[PDB]
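The freezer alarm interrupted the setup, so I double-checked each line after restarting. Inputs confirmed:
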Amino acid sequence: XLLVXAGLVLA
Amino acid sequence: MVNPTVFFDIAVDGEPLGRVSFELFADKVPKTAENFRALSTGEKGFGYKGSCFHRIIPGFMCQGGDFTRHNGTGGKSIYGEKFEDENFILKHTGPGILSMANAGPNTNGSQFFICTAKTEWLDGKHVVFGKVKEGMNIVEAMERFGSRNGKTSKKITIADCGQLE
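Predicted 3D structure, all chains:
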């Protein structure tokens, strides 16, 4: 999808 | 207290692109603003100078702030490895919004993103702490080196950074 994560980037 | 202003001098593959400046909303989120400010000046002995934007997605945002691992797994705050979500008073209202990247509730480090759209679906999960003042056109130019999966076609770097006032 459209996330802004640090390490495990998800859809 | 007057809200602080910071600048980034952006380079594409080592070649100067332009300056981006941010207002930090210390009047809403002083702890989060201070962290970004201090990493921007380097006064603690570490920070954003020389780091890159490892993840840029056109129409969405530019992500940076990982100055220890340069890929999204690293970075640290001036308070330690992580700090809490200060509050969610401010929302992702549109292009230019400056907001904290994280790995779940209360995992703020040094990673951040500059929005190039309204990203309402992130409200209440990511702490908004600033906004682009000058150089939105530079951010727009950065954006063009990104892709759907986030990988950059050229090295987008913070050649220099610090505080204006």
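Quick read of the result. Chain B touches chain A through 22 residues (CB under 8 Å).
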